[PDB]
Amino acid sequence: TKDNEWAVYTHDSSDPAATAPTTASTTLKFNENGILESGGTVNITTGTINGATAATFSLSFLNSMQQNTGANNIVATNQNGYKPGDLVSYQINNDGTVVGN
Amino acid sequence: SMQINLNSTDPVPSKTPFSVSDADSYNKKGTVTVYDSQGNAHDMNVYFVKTKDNEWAVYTHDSSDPAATAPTTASTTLKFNENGILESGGTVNITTGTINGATAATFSLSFLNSMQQNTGANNIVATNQNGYKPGDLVSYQINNDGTVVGN
Amino acid sequence: GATAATFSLSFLNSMQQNTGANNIVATNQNGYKPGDLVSYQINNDGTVVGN
Amino acid sequence: LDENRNLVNMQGMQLTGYPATGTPPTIQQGANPAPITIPNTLMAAKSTTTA
Numbered sequence: 001t002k003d004n005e006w007a008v009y010t011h012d013s014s015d016p017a018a019t020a021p022t023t024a025s026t027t028l029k030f031n032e033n034g035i036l037e038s039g040g041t042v043n044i045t046t047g048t049i050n051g052a053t054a055a056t057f058s059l060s061f062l063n064s065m066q067q068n069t070g071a072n073n074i075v076a077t078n079q080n081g082y083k084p085g086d087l088v089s090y091q092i093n094n095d096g097t098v099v100g101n
Numbered sequence: 102s103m104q105i106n107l108n109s110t111d112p113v114p115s116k117t118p119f120s121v122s123d124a125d126s127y128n129k130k131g132t133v134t135v136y137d138s139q140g141n142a143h144d145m146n147v148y149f150v151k152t153k154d155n156e157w158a159v160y161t162h163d164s165s166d167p168a169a170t171a172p173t174t175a176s177t178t179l180k181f182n183e184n185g186i187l188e189s190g191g192t193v194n195i196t197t198g199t200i201n202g203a204t205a206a207t208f209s210l211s212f213l214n215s216m217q218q219n220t221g222a223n224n225i226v227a228t229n230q231n232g233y234k235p236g237d238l239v240s241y242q243i244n245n246d247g248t249v250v251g252n
Numbered sequence: 253g254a255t256a257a258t259f260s261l262s263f264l265n266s267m268q269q270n271t272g273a274n275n276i277v278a279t280n281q282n283g284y285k286p287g288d289l290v291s292y293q294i295n296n297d298g299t300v301v302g303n
Numbered sequence: 304l305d306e307n308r309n310l311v312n313m314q315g316m317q318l319t320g321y322p323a324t325g326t327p328p329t330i331q332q333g334a335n336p337a338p339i340t341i342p343n344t345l346m347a348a349k350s351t352t353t354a
Contacts (some may be wrong), residue, residue: 068136134335223333
């Protein structure tokens with residue numbers, strides 16, 4: 001929106017009835033060094049598909065950095081939710097820990 | 102650090118005073134690239150105009166900032182001894198413009214090791230600056246002394 | 253019976269000077285026509301492009 | 304010459320060198336090396352000032 005000021009919107013492409021985002025979800029503000037100063041965390045709620053609860057999760061932009069890189073590149077993405085799965089294999093590690101993959 | 106060789110026989114430009122637009126108004130032009138806190142590249146254009154014998158006015162202006170003031174006052178003045186040794190004015194503090202929220206780059210630019218003789222043409226010997234742009238790992242290596250160096 | 257096509261026509265970069273005659277430097281447009289696939293290729297940057 | 308009419312090798316390796324700057328453009332040995340560009344755009348006219 002101006003120098004060191006980045007409005008950030010969130011949208012859910014999976015929901016066939018998702019509402020088009022009209023209001024800013026958050027605003028990333030950047031110090032003189034391009035580091036985060038505010039707006040790095042925001043609580044985002046998804047849509048309701050197939051009767052399941054919408055996922056209300058804290059999206060954190062921690063360590064986001066704006067400097068004269070050649071382009072806008074996403075460094076890392078991570079989320080702590082996982083889909084159900086069946087047991088595939090198992091192992092015994094060197095420290096005695098039994099791990100099922 | 103900016104090291105140059107200056108020619109003693111260059112005639113004083115008739116188109117006084119100094120004008121950025123006027124190419125013939127300056128005897129030599131050089132460019133050094135500096136960087137701000139946000140890594141923006143500023144092409145410091147420096148202009149060398151001989152005023153009298155062994156006296157050279159050096160002007161500075163950044164082409165990156167369209168809102169920067171036009172240089173109308175001496176950025177520095179190099180005074181030289183008889184045999185081409187530097188006398189005074191070889192170091193000056195230089196501040197760039199403010200581009201895209203980046204703070205102006207305040208750096209000490211030094212004309213040390215500059216020597217002025219009867220060179221056949223205007224040439225700049227060396228330009229060095231300790232700033233850079235952000236970089237990402239493209240390779241890593243281990244040297245013979247055991248130093249791990251990431252390029 | 254097609255819907256009316258309204259387009260922004262611009263004479264930008266056109267100039268009136270002492271050229272020998274009225275000469276068109278260039279024409280450009282964003283509209284196009286239907287046609288079938290002929291070739292497909294993968295460039296040096298990994299782009300898959302069909303001509 | 305490539306699509307933008309720049310001096311290129313077999314691979315698209317763009318030639319670079321000292322560009323021409325100013326009005327009229329002049330060769331500046333102190334200027335940073337820049338790619339050499341050869342546009343096909345027509346040349347405008349400069350009013351006579353000294354004869």
